[PDB]
Design a protein around this ligand. Structure first.
Ligand SMILES: C=CC(=O)N1CCN(CCCn2c(=O)c(-c3c(Cl)c(OC)cc(OC)c3Cl)cc3cnc(NC)nc32)CC1
Length: 298
């Protein structure tokens, strides 16, 4: 059956599968792994494991294998979900990646929105989220995307919900190696979560089925809006039908409340019609870095 890759192959009996982590289009499971670091063979670690759905066609198998091989080639970076190991021999196909304890960025932000709350303590009107951390989140997603771009990897669905947050609040770009079938997209279809993925698509991607890294930049611009709305849904109260014509008329989202003009400027820059007139991820990393270092250091 599948070829043995000793560099990545991990003994399946060293896995202890646990509770699911989400939906997927295979099954994702939180698992316990022993000896992932071969220097510490009896040391436990929490990982994420992707497997095949019950009654999976040969396509579902080919998709996961394809996704497995993409992650091998892209390599390691602190701001993406990294491949840890695989199980290809003598049993079902397992793909083992890093686990993000705090879930996706959208839920992270929404669950940490600021407080008519009865004031206790010295910091009652002080929410968990502060401006510099928000910028840091944006900066990390940018650096992560930059790495992917350098690996000639286009995400095609960059969004706050496709960014994962670790125990130490590190942003990791999720699901970057998926074959999402961009020729059969139901633009009207609303996900289980209530999301309309069409709201993250660049015009050249939506209208012309053209994806580039500049297409991801457009998406990143939408992600920027999500961050500083603390998990707000883009184009509020606009159904897909209206979004079509609005985008054709060149409509853009308004400046969100409590958002400095520097960042709304970057958003609008990412939403420039001409892809060449949008910033690169390298420029985004640099721009966001300047804002990050401009914080008051007491
Ligand atoms: C697409 C529709 C959908 O409805 N959904 C539900 C939400 N979404 C679940 C997040 C659960 N989840 C993953 O899918 C992965 C993960 C990632 Cl990103 C990979 O990218 C390359 C690859 C991979 O296998 C190869 C795994 Cl297994 C890693 C991961 C780490 N941590 C956590 N904790 C919540 N959850 C993860 C999966 C997509």
């Amino acid at each position: 059956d599948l070829p043995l890759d000793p560099l990545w192959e991990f003994p399946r009996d060293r896995l202890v599968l646990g509770k699911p982590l989400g939906e997927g289009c295979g099954q994702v499971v939180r698992a316990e792994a022993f000896g992932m670091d071969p220097a510490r063979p009896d040391q436990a670690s929490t990982v994420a494991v992707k497997m095949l759905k019950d009654n999976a066609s040969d396509k579902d198998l080919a998709d996961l294998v394809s996704e497995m091989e993409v992650m091998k080639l892209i390599g390691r970076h602190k701001n993406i979900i990294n491949l840890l190991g695989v199980c290809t021999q003598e049993g079902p196909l397992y793909v083992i990646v890093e686990c993000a304890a705090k879930g996706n960025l959208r839920e992270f932000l929404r669950a940490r929105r600021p407080p008519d709350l009865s004031p206790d303590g010295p910091r009652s009107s002080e929410g968990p989220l502060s401006f510099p951390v928000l910028v840091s989140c944006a900066y990390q997603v940018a650096r992560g995307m930059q790495y992917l771009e350098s690996r000639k990897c286009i995400h095609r669905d960059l969004a706050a919900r496709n960014v994962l947050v670790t125990e130490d609040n590190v942003m990791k770009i999720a699901d970057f190696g998926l074959a999402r079938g961009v020729h059969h997209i139901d633009y009207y279809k609303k996900t289980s979560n209530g999301r309309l993925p069409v709201k993250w698509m660049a015009p050249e991607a939506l209208f012309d089925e053209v994806y580039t890294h500049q297409s991801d930049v457009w998406s990143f611009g939408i992600l920027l809006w999500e961050i500083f709305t603390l998990g707000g849904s883009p184009y509020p109260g606009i159904p897909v039908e209206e979004l079509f014509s609005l985008l054709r008329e060149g409509h853009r989202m308004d400046r969100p409340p409590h958002c400095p003009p520097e960042l709304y400027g970057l958003m609008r820059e990412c939403w420039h019609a001409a892809p060449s007139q949008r910033p690169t991820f390298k420029q985004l990393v640099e721009a966001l870095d300047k804002v990050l270092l401009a914080v008051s250091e007491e």
